[PDB]
Design a protein around this ligand. Sequence first.
Ligand SMILES: NCc1ccc(C(F)(F)F)cc1
Length: 330
Amino acid sequence: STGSATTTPIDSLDDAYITPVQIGTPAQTLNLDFDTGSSDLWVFSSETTASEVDGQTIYTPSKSTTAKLLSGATWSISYGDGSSSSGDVYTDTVSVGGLTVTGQAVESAKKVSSSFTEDSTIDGLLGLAFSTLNTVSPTQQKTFFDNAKASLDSPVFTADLGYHAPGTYNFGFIDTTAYTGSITYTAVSTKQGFWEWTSTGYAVGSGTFKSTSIDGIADTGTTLLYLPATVVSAYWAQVSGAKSSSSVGGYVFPCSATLPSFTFGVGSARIVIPGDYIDFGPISTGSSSCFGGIQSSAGIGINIFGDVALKAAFVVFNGATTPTLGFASK
Ligand SMILES: NCc1ccc(C(F)(F)F)cc1
């Protein structure tokens, strides 16, 4: 079997992407953030403390004939940006774009941090990293992809994120009409539970390509591109008037500047990020200082190929017994 679902940016800056997911019987449709950097499927629910819900659609397990409380199970997650949530666990039927999985662990949020409360367009997250990162205790649970793996035509899913435009998540097949050229596959390390790979270098604008190994993770759940301080400094040095701001917490640049493209290497292939993709607009309403889409990973501890990078490519997440990542131009 296969599945295919449209994913939509939540705002005009592509800060995140939401994808409708059907949960329960009868279906309760929620718009979830598909996150290849985490492994928990959690949702706002009727059990979430009311003051922490502001416009989100909630999952009501009592209205689902297939929902079952997973007795004694709890979950607690904290993300790299400081956000966190926790609650209990149900099992229910979950369908993504026609692809259905029974007995999927649906983690009901009882408490959520303020960054989720203020994001009224995101009803939850669907984790697509490896299941070793799942936070359910005492019995760890499998991701939606893991549970669907046996039923898929091919054990893959693909991410085709749009720039200021809708995109597609596909499960179980590779759409050969959605990219150009050939797909370049590269090795994945699962040692930390992430879709971790090694980029072969970078280039700034029309500069010479610098061959150097950048270890990082492909993370659809992170907005920006986080790279070592040496690379990021070399990029912003080409933008007139750009500087790192401590009060803003990153590199900013004059909104009147034109940004150079950024190229990253996948084996012998090259993925080019247009400079327009790196503009994230004024730091405040009316400001003439703009926030940059490429930032340093020094404080994070890990390099993150977030949406800024991934939306420039067609990305294959190959979940075979030896997992690989595929990148193609589009
Ligand atoms: N990468 C996990 C993640 C995804 C989304 C959010 C936000 F922005 F919606 F709060 C935080 C953390």
